[PDB]
Structures are given as structure tokens and as C-alpha cells.
């Protein structure tokens, strides 16, 4: 509309209405110029055997993008508590996005002193990739999302993508994308932008823990009418072979017939937080579970959803089977264990095999008068008819959705880092500053213009999500476990700022507190 | 549109699968867009 009028307002809050909760977040952003308005080809710079798994080919673009795909973007710690203590499940419904109060600044630097002024006629370009025609980078747990704390101003991350590569070289099948070749809306300082999005139907995330285990579903007072083989020999001696059968009952619950079995496993190596218990060797990469694709090895991370550890042992964690978050101010490389937060999937032990254990045993031969029965350990087990399992939990710091790859087939497309898998997830929102050239020469030149005015933009983003709730119906008599704050005195309030104004998140918070019968 | 009754397949303009340091009709590492070769219009055939 105009230079002196505001194109939007600040909306941050949650509205709890019945079975719906509506969250709204507003943040202030800053967008630089990336790559000097250039598309640039990029590839791994390394050589040798080590480079092999790390090889890539792709492009970086002048564009930035908006990422709201973490939960702490949309929920305060109190709202997340209010969610996870009272509800058995939740899921996103609608999405509403706004971009407003756009300001374009020009920077003239002379003799080491820089001046910043408004450029009132400059534009910023924005479009959403509604047709999912661009490579989709939002499901890779990247940085650059809206900050959890509403008072922080954040920088918009640069967009880039990878295409097919052989080592660091490309192939004829590799694709190049100009983002200028999409239609986009152009905004001066009075203009604003919005769009709305509709989540496709997904299952409720299961924010509850089971109060029964898959192997304990029987009535503890009654026998089965099934029999099992109790004895193959009468005793010590020669030629003692016999067949004896017993009823499965309360005394022996391990041999009873069951209708359902625990879910699939891919074994992880077990690491202790007590370092003297670990082996004195480097086994981080060498001893890691991995999968290979076209010759390259990828770590299995986090992998299939499995219980992090056995009951009573919390000092162990899967080598690359858990999500690990950094504490506030944690460095990038080779930080100690107290600098990171290792989450655990202990709640899913009821239906899921432990990550660091074998699935079970199988017979490896035929026993005979000349051959003893032999067994072997099942290190990995794929889906069997009759398996039941839980997905990975979601966290306040963790991702919300992922894009399901477009393929002939998939199974249980729920994404492995947690959250909601979608064939049409929330679309990517691309933004860049329109280049403003400096003064051209006075005689014509056919070369493209490499001289521009140094420029950046800033503004406000609001995002609104409607969430559907699934309320707890339980008949449990005794009280539940709840997520709660601790009363003990401390130098800081958790989930607040410190004396320097730095907001931190003390610990990762999962979703599973309330219980359900298995 | 091409109406042809030709049985055997046509010549088409196509990219080459062989690996290269650059994708044709893309930018290089410095951001320079180039056009590798001139491309004509005549591939499909018609009877004289």
C-alpha cells in the first residue's frame, strides 16, 4: 500500500479450543544477498577413499528460504507441557503464512565506515513451490528455522540442492534448476505476502506410553489350553530321548503362545556414558551400522525405531540410534558429552526390540542323533506378519514433518527422525532480494552486469498452524506420570533468559507421559 | 504436431549420460551460464 503504513501486525499466542489448538508465531528476519546474485556449481573438494561416502555435486542459489519445521517454532514450553500431559495424540491440520513489513536497506561503505539507508523502491521476490517442482530440502533437520524464543531476530538460510553425482562429477541425468524461472511475487516496502496450506490426512502422533508389554498380555491367573514341548530326554544316560509336553500357564509366561510379536530391528552398537566401560579404540565410524547406496556408505541414523536401552541400564545409548541435540552455546566440532543432550526411546520398549540387542534366535540346522541343535543370533529382522511397533517420539526441538520420497513403493512412510510423513508437505517458501545494478557504463557492453548496490532486507514473518487433539479417555485409577518443573531453587529459571539475555532449552522434552493399554 | 506412420524410431535431440565436470546448459563454479552447442530444430522426419 504505502511507505508510511504498516502491512501487518504481530501475532504470537496459542488458542486452546476444545479438540483444537491454534498456535501463531511471529518473528523478525534479515535476508542478505547470497552468492552476489549468482547461481554456482558446487561439489566436494576432498580426495581419497574418505571422500567417496562424502562425495556430492549440486548448486547454491542466490535465494533464501523460510523453515518453520521444528516444534519449538510453534509451541512455547508451557504450551508443549499443556499438550503432552493432557492428550493421547495430535496432528497438524491447517497452515497460514504471512510475510509483511518489508524493509530494503542499502549499504554504502566508504573508507571503512558504513552507512545504511532505506531504499524505498527496491523489491524482494517470494514464491512458494506449490507443485513440488524444486528439490525439497526441508526434511533434513537443518538449521535456519525460526528461533524458539520470539524476541530473537534470525538470519534466513541460503537455498541449495544436490543432484546426481559420480564422485564430484555430474552425469547427463543431473538436473539444474533456475529459481528465476518460476513466477514470483515482487514486494516493495508497502506490499505483503500470504498463502494458506492444508495438511493432508496423517495419523495422530502417538503421544503416550504403553502400560503393558507385548509379552505380558495374558491373564496371569489362568492356564492356556495350548501345550509346549517341555522335555526331550528322561535324564542322564544313553538313549534317553522322549517327548514330554506341558501346559503353558502363569508359572512359565515365556513359553506361552502369543498372537503378536515385536517389530523389526537393525542392531546398533552400544556406547556407555561411563567412558571407562567403553573399549580403548576408535570405533565410532568403524563400528557403526550403515547402509550402502550406489557404492557409498551412509550411517544408519537414527534408523528404525528401537528402544534405546534395556530397563535399568540408562547409561548406554545406541551408537547412532538416537537424536542428539546440542545445549545452548555448544560448539560445532568434538564437544564433550555434557555439551549435548542425548534423547532416548525408552518408552517404546513394550513393543519394540532394544536397539543394542539381537532380535532373537533361530534354528540353524536339523538336530539329529548325530547332531545337536544349533541356534544363531538374529542381528537384523525385517517385517514379519504379526509385528507391532511404535514410531519414534517427537521433541520440542525436533522436526515436525518430512516429505515422503516419490517412489513406486514405500512401507510405513513415517519419517525416521520423527514426525509426520507427507506426500505433499508444507511447501518451500523461497525469498531473495532483487538485484539492483550500479551505474552501467555509458557505452554499450554485452556482458552481464557484475556491479550491484550492496543491499539487504528485513521484515516480519508470522506462521499459524491449527492442530487437532486426541484426548485421554483412560480408566486408570492411580495418577499418571506428568512432565513438570522442579521446585528446587536455581540461579536461572529453566526455559528463560539468563542475565545476558540468552534463551536456552535445558533439556529435550518428549511427548510420551500418559499411558494406554497395549 | 507430428502425424507420422514411420515404424522405426526417430532421431531425437538428447543429453549425453557420460560424466562431466559441468552440466550442459547450466552455470559453472563461477556462476557463468553457457550454451555448449548450437541446437537446430530438425530431428523428426517427413516424407518428401
Amino acid at each position, epitope marked *: 500500500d504505502g511507505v508510511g503504513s504498516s502491512s501487518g501486525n504481530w501475532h504470537c499466542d496459542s488458542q486452546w479450543l476444545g479438540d483444537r489448538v491454534i498456535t501463531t508465531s511471529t518473528r523478525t528476519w534479515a535476508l542478505p544477498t547470497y552468492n552476489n546474485h549468482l547461481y554456482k556449481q558446487i561439489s566436494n573438494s*576432498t*580426495s*581419497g*577413499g574418505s571422500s567417496n561416502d562424502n562425495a556430492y555435486f549440486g548448486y547454491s542459489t542466490p535465494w533464501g528460504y523460510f523453515d518453520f519445521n521444528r516444534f519449538h517454532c510453534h509451541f512455547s514450553p508451557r504450551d508443549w507441557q499443556r499438550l503432552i500431559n493432557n492428550n493421547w495424540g495430535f496432528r497438524p491440520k491447517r497452515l497460514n503464512f504471512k510475510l509483511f513489513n518489508i524493509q530494503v536497506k542499502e549499504v554504502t561503505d566508504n573508507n571503512g565506515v558504513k552507512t545504511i539507508a532505506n531504499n524505498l523502491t527496491s523489491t524482494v521476490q517470494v514464491f512458494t513451490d506449490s507443485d513440488y517442482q524444486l528439490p525439497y530440502v526441508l526434511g533434513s533437520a537443518h538449521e535456519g528455522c525460526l528461533p524458539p524464543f520470539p524476541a530473537d531476530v534470525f538470519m534466513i538460510p541460503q537455498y541449495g540442492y544436490l543432484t546426481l553425482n559420480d564422485g*564430484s*562429477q555430474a552425469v547427463g541425468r543431473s538436473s539444474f534448476y533456475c529459481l528465476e524461472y518460476f513466477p514470483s511475487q515482487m514486494l516493495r516496502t508497502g506490499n505483503n505476502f500470504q498463502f494458506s496450506y492444508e495438511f493432508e490426512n496423517v495419523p495422530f502422533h502417538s503421544s503416550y506410553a504403553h502400560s503393558q508389554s507385548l509379552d505380558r498380555l495374558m491373564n496371569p491367573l489362568i492356564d492356556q489350553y495350548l501345550y509346549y514341548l517341555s522335555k526331550t530326554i528322561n535324564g542322564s544316560g544313553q538313549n534317553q530321548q522322549t517327548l514330554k509336553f506341558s501346559v503353558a500357564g502363569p508359572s512359565n509366561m515365556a513359553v506361552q503362545g502369543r498372537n503378536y510379536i515385536p517389530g523389526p530391528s537393525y542392531r546398533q552398537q552400544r556406547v556407555s556414558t561411563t567412558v571407562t566401560q567403553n573399549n580403548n579404540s*576408535e570405533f565410532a565410524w*568403524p563400528g557403526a551400522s550403515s547402509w550402502a547406496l550406489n557404492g557409498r556408505n551412509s550411517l544408519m541414523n537414527p534408523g528404525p525405531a528401537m528402544a534405546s536401552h534395556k530397563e535399568g541400564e540408562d547409561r548406554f545409548f545406541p551408537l547412532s540410534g538416537s537424536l542428539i541435540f546440542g545445549k545452548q552455546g555448544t560448539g560445532r566440532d568434538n564437544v564433550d558429552a555434557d555439551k549435548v543432550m542425548i534423547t532416548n526411546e525408552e518408552e517404546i520398549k513394550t513393543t519394540n526390540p532394544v536397539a543394542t540387542e539381537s532380535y532373537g534366535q533361530v534354528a540353524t540346522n536339523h538336530q539329529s542323533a548325530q547332531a545337536q541343535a544349533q541356534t544363531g543370533w538374529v542381528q537384523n529382522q525385517g517385517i514379519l506378519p504379526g509385528m507391532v511397533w511404535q514410531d519414534r517420539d517427537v521433541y520440542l526441538q525436533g522436526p515436525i514433518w518430512a516429505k515422503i520420497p516419490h517412489t513406486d513403493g514405500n512401507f510405513h512412510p513415517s519419517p525416521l527422525m520423527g514426525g509426520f510423513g507427507m506426500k505433499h508437505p508444507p511447501p518451500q517458501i523461497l525469498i531473495k532480494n532483487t538485484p539492483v545494478p550500479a551505474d552501467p557504463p555509458t557505452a554499450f557492453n554485452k556482458d552481464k552486469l557484475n556491479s550491484f548496490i550492496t543491499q539487504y532486507s528485513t521484515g516480519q514473518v508470522s506462521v499459524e498452524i491449527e492442530w487437532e487433539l486426541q484426548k485421554e479417555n483412560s480408566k486408570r485409577w492411580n495418577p499418571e506420570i506428568q512432565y513438570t518443573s522442579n521446585y528446587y531453587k536455581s540461579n536461572n529459571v529453566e526455559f528463560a533468559v539468563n542475565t545476558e539475555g540468552v534463551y536456552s532449552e535445558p533439556r529435550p522434552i518428549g511427548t510420551r507421559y500418559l499411558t494406554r493399554n497395549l | 504436431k507430428e502425424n507420422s506412420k514411420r515404424w522405426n524410431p526417430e532421431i531425437q535431440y538428447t543429453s549425453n549420460y557420460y560424466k*562431466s565436470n559441468n552440466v550442459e546448459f547450466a552455470v559453472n563454479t563461477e556462476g557463468v551460464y553457457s550454451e555448449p552447442r548450437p541446437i537446430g530444430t530438425r530431428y523428426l522426419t517427413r516424407n518428401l
Partner: antibody
Amino acid sequence: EVQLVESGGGLVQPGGSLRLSCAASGFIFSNYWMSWVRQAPGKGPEWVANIKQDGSANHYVDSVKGRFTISRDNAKNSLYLQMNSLRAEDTAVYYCAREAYQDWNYDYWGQGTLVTVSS
Amino acid sequence: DIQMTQSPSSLSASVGDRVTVTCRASEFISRYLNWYQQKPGKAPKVLIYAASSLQSGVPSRFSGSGSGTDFTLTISSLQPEDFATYYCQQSYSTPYTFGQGTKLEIK
């Protein structure tokens, strides 16, 4: 089939600068990483530098950092090593090698040129 | 960087003998280990690359095994042509490093 030829070897006083050129006739030169390997007299060979198949990146061994520049011309199928501030230790036979695709070993080696740094 | 240690430094055997050379790595270099045979006045020639795999046009008597930090070069039915200096090199990371070398002697 694949031939690598090294030229420009010779004697130079210390602090002197020398340039080495490698010619490759037998293959697609732009698909491969190329290296420089030197073997001092009576010693095992030693890796000096490599350069990317398009020339975007390059690596050097610590001893020679800043004094040597590896360079690549894909149109002429030639590899160049630029040596500055030469030392007595530097004198060795210089080998031009091609790094194998995927495996990364030196599948092909040039005959090599002897380069002497003498007072 | 990574250090490569080759043993023994020198070895002497006779035609028909079985010779074994051991290479050790300071750090994990996976399967990226090569064995080079070198004769005076010539460049090193690759015999075995990527741990186990044999170079084409090389006799089947040369064999290689091992992964991670320990590798071994095995020669069965030794021949007069086989006497040379042998190097183990790691192509896993830069700077690429070579072993000290094992020299074989006529008996």
C-alpha cells in the same frame, strides 16, 4: 595406451624456481585427479600435491605449502607443477601420477624427471 | 596425518618360497591400501589395490588381505622377477602416505 610424460627437470641453485609439465595422451584428462609424487635418492617415494579434475581444488603436503603451485590445463591435457624457493631436501625424482577412479591408487605413472638442487 | 608402518624392512628368500609383508596404519583407512612393486630406475607399479583386489595383468601369485588398520601382502611361489622393493600406500586421505619399504633379496 595411457602415457604420462614429465619435462622441465634439471639442476638449479637453492632458492631457485622451476616449472614441471606433464603430458597425457591416453585418456580423458578431465575425468581424473592428478598427483605429483617425488622420490628422493635412496628413499621411499613421497606425495607432493594433487589437483581436482576441473582444477577447482588442490592439496599440498605441509613441507612444500606456499612454495609450490599445482595447476591443470584441460584443453592441452597437461599438468603443471610450479616450484619456488627450492631446497637441498627438495631435490628428488618427480613423478606425475594419475589417481584411479573409486579406488584412488596410482594406476598410471609417468617416467619422471630428475630435479637437482645444488649449491 | 596417518603413519604407515611396514614390516620387515628387509627380507631374503629363494625361488618358490612364500613371502609375507605386513603393513600397519595409525588410523582407520578402510580398504584404501595399495601395494606397489618397484625396480631400480622405474616408477612404482601397482600390484594390489583396495586391500584384497589384484591389478589386471599381474600374476595370480600376488595376494593381499586385511582391512581397517592391518594389512598383509602375500607372495606364493616366488620368482626371480619378484625381487624388488615393495611399498604399501594409503589412498584414504591426504597427504597420501607410503610405507618405508621392503626389499627382497636373491638366495
